[PDB]
Design a protein around this ligand. Structure first.
Ligand SMILES: [Mg+2]
Ligand SMILES: [Mg+2]
Ligand SMILES: [Mg+2]
Ligand SMILES: [Mg+2]
Ligand SMILES: [Mg+2]
Ligand SMILES: [Mg+2]
Ligand SMILES: [Mg+2]
Ligand SMILES: [Mg+2]
Ligand SMILES: [Mg+2]
Ligand SMILES: [Mg+2]
Ligand SMILES: [Mg+2]
Ligand SMILES: [Mg+2]
Ligand SMILES: [Mg+2]
Ligand SMILES: [Mg+2]
Ligand SMILES: [Mg+2]
Ligand SMILES: [Mg+2]
Ligand SMILES: [Mg+2]
Ligand SMILES: [Mg+2]
Ligand SMILES: [Mg+2]
Ligand SMILES: [Mg+2]
Ligand SMILES: [Mg+2]
Ligand SMILES: [Mg+2]
Ligand SMILES: [Mg+2]
Ligand SMILES: [Mg+2]
Ligand SMILES: [Mg+2]
Ligand SMILES: [Mg+2]
Ligand SMILES: [Mg+2]
Ligand SMILES: [Mg+2]
Ligand SMILES: [Mg+2]
Ligand SMILES: [Mg+2]
Ligand SMILES: [Mg+2]
Ligand SMILES: [Mg+2]
Ligand SMILES: [Mg+2]
Ligand SMILES: [Mg+2]
Ligand SMILES: [Mg+2]
Ligand SMILES: [Mg+2]
Ligand SMILES: [Mg+2]
Ligand SMILES: [Mg+2]
Ligand SMILES: [Mg+2]
Ligand SMILES: [Mg+2]
Ligand SMILES: [Mg+2]
Ligand SMILES: [Mg+2]
Ligand SMILES: [Mg+2]
Ligand SMILES: [Mg+2]
Ligand SMILES: [Mg+2]
Ligand SMILES: [Mg+2]
Ligand SMILES: [Mg+2]
Ligand SMILES: [Mg+2]
Ligand SMILES: [Mg+2]
Ligand SMILES: [Mg+2]
Ligand SMILES: [Mg+2]
Ligand SMILES: [Mg+2]
Ligand SMILES: [Mg+2]
Ligand SMILES: [Mg+2]
Ligand SMILES: [Mg+2]
Ligand SMILES: [Mg+2]
Lengths: 95, 285, 48, 119
RNA sequence: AUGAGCAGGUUGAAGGUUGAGUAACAUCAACUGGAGGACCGAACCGACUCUCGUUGAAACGAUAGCGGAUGACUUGUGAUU
RNA sequence: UGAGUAACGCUUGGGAGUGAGAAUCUCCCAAACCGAUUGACUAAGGUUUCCUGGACCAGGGUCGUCCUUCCAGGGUUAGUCUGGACCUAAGCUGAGGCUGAAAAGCGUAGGCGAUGGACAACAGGUUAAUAUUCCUGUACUUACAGUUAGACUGAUGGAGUGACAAAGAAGGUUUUCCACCCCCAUAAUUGGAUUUGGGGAUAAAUCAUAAGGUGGUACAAUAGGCAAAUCCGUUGUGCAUAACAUUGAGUGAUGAUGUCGAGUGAAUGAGUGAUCAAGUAGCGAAGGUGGUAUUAAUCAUGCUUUCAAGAAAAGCUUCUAGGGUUAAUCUAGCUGUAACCAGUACCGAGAACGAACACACGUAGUCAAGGAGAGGAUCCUAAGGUUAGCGAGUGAACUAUAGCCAAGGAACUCUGCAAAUUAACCCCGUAAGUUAGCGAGAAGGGGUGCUUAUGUAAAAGUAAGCCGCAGUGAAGAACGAGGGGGGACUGUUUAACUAAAACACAACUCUAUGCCAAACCGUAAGGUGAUGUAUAUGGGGUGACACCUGCCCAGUGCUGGAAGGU
């Protein structure tokens, strides 16, 4: 509802491999406390097309910059893979 | 009766003997009634604190407790029929699955001599002197075998419940109550008038002559090895230490916890049941 | 050979965890002392 | 001291000679250690002089030494030896191969040697 | 408390059936049956011996033999003193 | 300093290339070990160690252009898998409450707690890294609403099922395997070749058919199941070679004009060429008949026997209660809507885990190829995987591991310690003693190869012939006899110097204990003993089996005792 559960879209080799060929799959990063139903509602209230299904990924934090004078940990990410129906492809930028 | 076991396994020789359980039991199969079946949790000789309390206990096989009607007072005035004599792993004596006229089922300690189809009946009037009939001690003629004697009136059977256990009636007392009962071990007691008991000797009279042939059989029965005190360290037992096989050394044998224990009497004479005892297997009171 | 420490994620958390320490007076005293020493790893719960 | 390495066994030595001689017959040059070239030279010369008659008995004798290489098989190495290499040395009184010493290796300081077919 | 494991091959008990036998028992013969803290021997468990090692590959092992291997057996997970 | 000394912790050769520099990096060809494993799937643990590109401060027992090291980017997709939203075992917590100087201990109702129970998805493909998760194909399950038809609905409670031990042997059906046949490639210069090598597959789900397995079936009365009952239990009657109820591996048809498939095999582009590209994309034939006296899997939570007598709850079915009657609820069908949370990478160990080390150690389960073989033993290899992260020489003394040693054969030594002989299968034969079970694989001997013929379903065997010094020709297989001491035996014990005569064990005896039992943990509550009852429990001593166990009650210990003295 508040639509703070759609933080940032991400574009990788896997994302672009899926984002072509009829059904498009758009991968965003979401609030780690959000659920699939909240993700579908946010896409409804901010894009307008009902997702066909949603898949979720949790990437655990890991050590980064190891051996550097001050080592640091990573940040917890939840990834969401929305898939719109056949023949529809909306743009992530431009509204 | 008893039947020998011929192992013919060439690792020692053991003339093991077991109860037949074939000509004494109706069906050799193990088919207990589901309704009266609760499972027993093996304490292993450990109290609620988890510490070993009674030594040499632990390691028995899984058992399911069969609910036994020691009271036999709920369905009074109702004729019961024995249906099967079965094996109870929690007591040396066989148990009979009896059924009442109304359709209720129960387990009772099986009297010796009864077979399938023998009628039973309990109440608080004369009834009849038949094996298995349970009546209060007031109406039993003196001389008959009785088991499942109730100490506290309206309670359950407590005395003479093991295999082949019985007690004889030895008249009454001038008090108008405390009927005399001559029990096993040559002890004479005074049981209250209202107390209820069952006539007949308990079955499985040949449980004395069963001979275990192996350590494993006794281990599966639930007995752990008992270490003698002479083999102990000078710590953990008074009879320890020594240089070689040593005698007791003290003035008398001692418990692991250090008391005399030999010939000494350990009965609390300041008990309300002392006045109800005529002999204590040795003499008066 | 079987060495002394055989790691287990459950046994560790159920023996030296925060909830285990916060169930008895002795554990509360231990946690108070560790706060006095300002240990970053107060208990084994904060493995990361 | 135990659980030692198998070592430079006699079987290993024969296999090493077999591999180097098969390669030197296939390509024509071998860059090895000097003490290994000085031992492969004997077998190389023996194979070449026995392969001068080209009868089936001589093929059976050579096949107990030749091994498969990248440039030729065990059957095409036979054709190369009996039709191309050996006929060249038809009246040379021995000494078909030369061993010359290169510099020491960077990681061993062992003396390298190139073994070649002397034209 | 709840689960799992013991490759493979032998010996052939009690009991039962049949026949002879007995005045009827007992006993004997054949067949069935497959018991044993049974036997040989892998995984598995254990550690009896020689040698090596003793600033080790190793704060207790390696090679070669060795004992048990359906049981008072071995082991995983969880609880507890 | 020792000292540039010991050590560098099980695995080879060559060709081409990169690079400033190569035994150590990449590719190729061999070579050597593993192959009941160094192969493949995962649990636990580890926590990014996984993939790509770059680098060679440090780490790698050498080197390094390379790494499980460092830098940058990326990688883990679930209604059906593993766990919660379901249930309980040991046990933990535990309002009240009991006990206790205090802190606290015990404990009822409730609540947690898998290593167990219940619950719906299979086949193939795809990326450098994920796949019962993504894609394709075909399915299933649970909720909610509308609708059609039928039916009275029936639980927080009652009952049944769920629900179970060990060992053993028979069957039924698929298999393994054997024989034939089909298809593909091959036709061989070293003497002869008329052949050689490889493949023969399809799941969940739906429908029909099911070898069989389990247990008697209906009717009538009921006083018992914290009320009620049409359900259960009980009592009678009829029919009971069967009927009825439930369950059931396999078979056939869709799923499948699909997928997989031996092999054939590019183009495109990189490159000086080969080669890569790649042996990749694509193409892709047959995709079967009979037997079995051989195999393993399932039916099977099936059956039989034995004593040591072998989990609970949820769930499912059913019963009324309780609610409806001008209704609700349930069943079957159609349409639509929804299916949450956590894990999913990689290793899984002579380099990712526990051992400080890229340490010869240890770590649950699952798949298990061929030949000979009883075999998962043994030797060599298949699918697959590795190159034991210091090398090159030499072949002194000396050491470790092996092999052999003429004549003698324990003369060696504390002692045949160690080493050596035997070893598998088949056929003969086998003593003293005994608790009649054993001793016993006793001791002692013989045969094993290949060919032909006879034997069989296959054998085994039998007869003749041939070769060698030797024929389970190699690997893996018990040395034996006699007398004595101790322990009856099988077992257990000092993790890391003592495995034994020590401990234990079945058995004997004494003693205490009448149940709120004796004994024991605590201070007490509480609890073990025991949901047991003298044929039972605790303690002391002895330790199969057989024969015996003698005298002393002065002292000590124990039991009992009239009075009397203190
Ligand atoms: Mg997920
Ligand atoms: Mg005892
Ligand atoms: Mg006892
Ligand atoms: Mg001692
Ligand atoms: Mg003392
Ligand atoms: Mg003493
Ligand atoms: Mg002495
Ligand atoms: Mg060799
Ligand atoms: Mg045995
Ligand atoms: Mg110094
Ligand atoms: Mg120096
Ligand atoms: Mg020196
Ligand atoms: Mg030196
Ligand atoms: Mg050295
Ligand atoms: Mg090394
Ligand atoms: Mg090497
Ligand atoms: Mg090999
Ligand atoms: Mg492996
Ligand atoms: Mg790291
Ligand atoms: Mg990499
Ligand atoms: Mg790189
Ligand atoms: Mg270096
Ligand atoms: Mg799906
Ligand atoms: Mg739970
Ligand atoms: Mg589980
Ligand atoms: Mg992978
Ligand atoms: Mg030819
Ligand atoms: Mg009632
Ligand atoms: Mg129950
Ligand atoms: Mg994986
Ligand atoms: Mg290892
Ligand atoms: Mg490690
Ligand atoms: Mg190493
Ligand atoms: Mg394992
Ligand atoms: Mg094999
Ligand atoms: Mg092997
Ligand atoms: Mg020799
Ligand atoms: Mg010789
Ligand atoms: Mg000699
Ligand atoms: Mg001689
Ligand atoms: Mg001598
Ligand atoms: Mg001498
Ligand atoms: Mg010896
Ligand atoms: Mg003998
Ligand atoms: Mg003597
Ligand atoms: Mg012994
Ligand atoms: Mg022993
Ligand atoms: Mg020791
Ligand atoms: Mg020892
Ligand atoms: Mg008390
Ligand atoms: Mg109790
Ligand atoms: Mg003794
Ligand atoms: Mg003795
Ligand atoms: Mg005496
Ligand atoms: Mg006296
Ligand atoms: Mg006295």
């Amino acid at each position: 509802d508040v639509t703070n559960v759609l933080l940032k879209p991400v574009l990788t080799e896997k994302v672009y491999f899926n984002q072509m060929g009829e059904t498009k799959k758009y991968v965003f990063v979401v609030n780690p406390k959000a659920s699939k139903t909240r993700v579908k509602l946010a896409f409804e209230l901010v894009y307008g097309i009902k997702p066909l299904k949603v898949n979720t990924l949790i990437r655990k934090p890991t050590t980064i910059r190891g051996g550097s004078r001050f080592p640091g940990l990573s940040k917890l990410e939840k990834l969401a893979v929305i898939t719109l129906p056949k023949g529809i492809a909306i743009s992530v930028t431009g509204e | 009766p008893i039947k020998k076991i011929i192992s013919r396994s060439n690792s020692g020789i053991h003339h093991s003997t077991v109860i037949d359980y074939k000509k004494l039991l109706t069906t050799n199969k193990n088919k207990p009634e589901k309704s009266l079946l609760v499972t027993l949790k093996k304490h292993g000789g450990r109290n609620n604190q988890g510490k070993i309390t009674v030594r040499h206990q632990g390691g028995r096989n899984k058992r399911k407790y069969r609910i036994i009607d020691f009271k036999r007072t709920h369905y009074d005035n109702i004729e019961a029929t024995v249906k099967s004599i079965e094996y109870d792993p929690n007591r040396s004596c066989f148990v009979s699955l009896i059924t009442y006229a109304n359709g209720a089922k129960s387990y009772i300690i099986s009297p010796d001599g009864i077979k399938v189809g023998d009628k039973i009946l309990a109440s608080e009037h004369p009834i009849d002197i038949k094996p298995g009939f349970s009546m209060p001690l007031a109406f039993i003629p003196e001389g008959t075998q009785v088991h499942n004697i109730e100490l506290h009136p309206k309670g359950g059977g407590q005395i003479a419940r093991s295999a082949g256990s019985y007690a004889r009636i030895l008249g009454q007392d001038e008090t108008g109550k405390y009927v005399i009962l001559q029990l096993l071990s040559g002890e004479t007691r005074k049981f209250l008038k209202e107390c209820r008991a069952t006539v007949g000797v308990v079955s499985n009279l040949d449980h004395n002559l069963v001979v275990i042939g192996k350590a494993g059989r006794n281990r599966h029965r639930g007995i752990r090895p008992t270490v003698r005190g002479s083999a102990m360290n000078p710590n953990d037992h008074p009879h320890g230490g020594g240089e070689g096989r040593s005698p007791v050394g003290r003035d008398a044998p001692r418990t692991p916890w250090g008391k005399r224990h030999m010939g000494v009497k350990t009965r609390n004479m300041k008990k309300a049941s002392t006045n109800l005892i005529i002999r204590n297997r040795k003499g008066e009171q | 050979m079987k060495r002394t420490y055989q790691p287990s994620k459950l046994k560790r958390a159920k023996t030296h965890g925060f909830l285990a320490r916060m169930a008895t007076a002795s554990g509360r005293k231990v946690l108070k002392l560790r706060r006095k020493k300002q240990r970053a790893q107060l208990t084994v719960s904060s493995e990361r | 001291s135990y659980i030692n390495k198998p070592g430079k066994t006699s079987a290993w030595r024969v296999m090493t000679v077999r591999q180097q001689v098969s390669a030197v017959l296939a390509y024509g040059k071998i860059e090895t250690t000097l003490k290994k070239a000085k031992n492969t030279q004997k077998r190389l010369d023996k194979l070449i002089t026995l392969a001068k008659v080209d009868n089936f008995n001589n093929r059976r004798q050579v096949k107990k030494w030749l091994l498969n290489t990248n440039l030729f098989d065990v059957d095409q190495l036979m054709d190369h030896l009996f039709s191309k290499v050996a006929p060249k040395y038809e009246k040379t009184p021995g000494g078909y191969s030369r061993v010359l010493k290169l510099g020491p290796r960077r990681g061993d300081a062992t003396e390298m040697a190139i073994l070649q077919l002397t034209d």
